[PDB]
């Protein structure tokens, strides 16, 4: 035990359970409920004062959200220990990994699982996009879709964090180069950014590889994405119906992409 909220409600344990894009995640406890939570520290790095204003507001709206396919958000605050400042978020603890870990671990996803899990992602997104006002995820990826069990349901996570992962910022060329929706680079986005991201997720789940692996850096990716050049893995999608859905999601022009409604209504997404 290595920390607590200002109110003593949440404790942090000396048990690190994730480490990633500028965060460390620990096991924790809700002392009020006596139920285990994820204690995420957004790592000694500076948020802007403007981001903090947006974040105070966001955190309060996230605390209200419930849906089967969204990871629960409990509470948030700024915390320090020694010379390190972080923002803490406390969320529902997800103990069975991510779609990314699933693909790593079990090389392939069977089509009936793909269908069900993708329908659940769409239901989650429909839910967010239909909140008033709409919630746009803006950072959906296989590593932020959590599974409740190997045989369980999927829940979308890292709501909130997407605000602090900064599309229009200059960034280092380090690790695996990333893509996003064309319009996202300019921060000129709507819900359809999530549709694009969904398409990319489906592609990954269908191919068991990260799109654009044939690119060495994010500049090559940017040039391909904003010029309508598809990832090579697109051509490797085995099932034509799956490939068709992907293709309609990852259109360069946002106005031509499937809507979530149309995807949920697609033949594929009823059994
Ligand atoms: O956001 N992550 O990427 C994440 C990854 C892991 S991991 O150990 O699976 C790994 Cl080693 Cl980061 Br892939 C654990 C927790 C988290 N945060 C979640 C935030 C909201 C849902 C609840 C927890």
Curated annotation (Swiss-Prot):
Q: What is the effect of changing residue 23 to G?
A: Loss of kinase activity. Abolished serine/threonine-protein kinase activity without affecting ability to regulate localization of TRPV4
Listed result of changing residue 40 to A: No effect on kinase activity
What changing residue 161 to F does, per the record, is:
Decreased inhibition by Cl(-) ions
Query: Where is this protein localized, as stated in its record?
Result: Cytoplasm; Nucleus; Cytoplasm, Cytoskeleton, Spindle
Q: Which residues bind chloride?
A: 73, 89, 159, 161
Q: What is the effect of changing residue 40 to K?
A: Reduced kinase activity. Loss of kinase activity
The UniProt-reported impact of residue 159 to F is: Decreased inhibition by Cl(-) ions
Where in this protein does the record say Phosphoserine is found?
168, 172
Task: Name the residues annotated as catalytic in the UniProt entry.
Answer: 158
Record PTM: Ubiquitinated by the BCR(KLHL3) complex, leading to its degradation. Also ubiquitinated by the BCR(KLHL2) complex.
Q: Which residues bind ATP?
A: 21, 91-94, 141
Q: In the UniProt annotation, what is the result of changing residue 46 to M?
A: No effect on kinase activity
**What's this protein's function?**
Serine/threonine-protein kinase component of the WNK1-SPAK/OSR1 kinase cascade, which acts as a key regulator of blood pressure and regulatory volume increase by promoting ion influx. WNK1 mediates regulatory volume increase in response to hyperosmotic stress by acting as a molecular crowding sensor, which senses cell shrinkage and mediates formation of a membraneless compartment by undergoing liquid-liquid phase separation.
> Know anything about its domains from the record?
The RFXV motifs mediate recognition with downstream kinases OXSR1/OSR1 and STK39/SPAK. Disordered regions undergo liquid-liquid phase separation (LLPS) for the formation of a cytoplasmic membraneless compartment that concentrates WNK1 with its substrates, OXSR1/OSR1 and STK39/SPAK.
Name the family the entry cites. Belongs to the protein kinase superfamily. Ser/Thr protein kinase family. WNK subfamily.
Q: What is this protein called?
A: Serine/threonine-protein kinase WNK1
Organism, as annotated: Rattus norvegicus (Rat)
- Report the gene name: Wnk1
Coverage of the whole protein, first to last residue?
211 to 481 of 2126
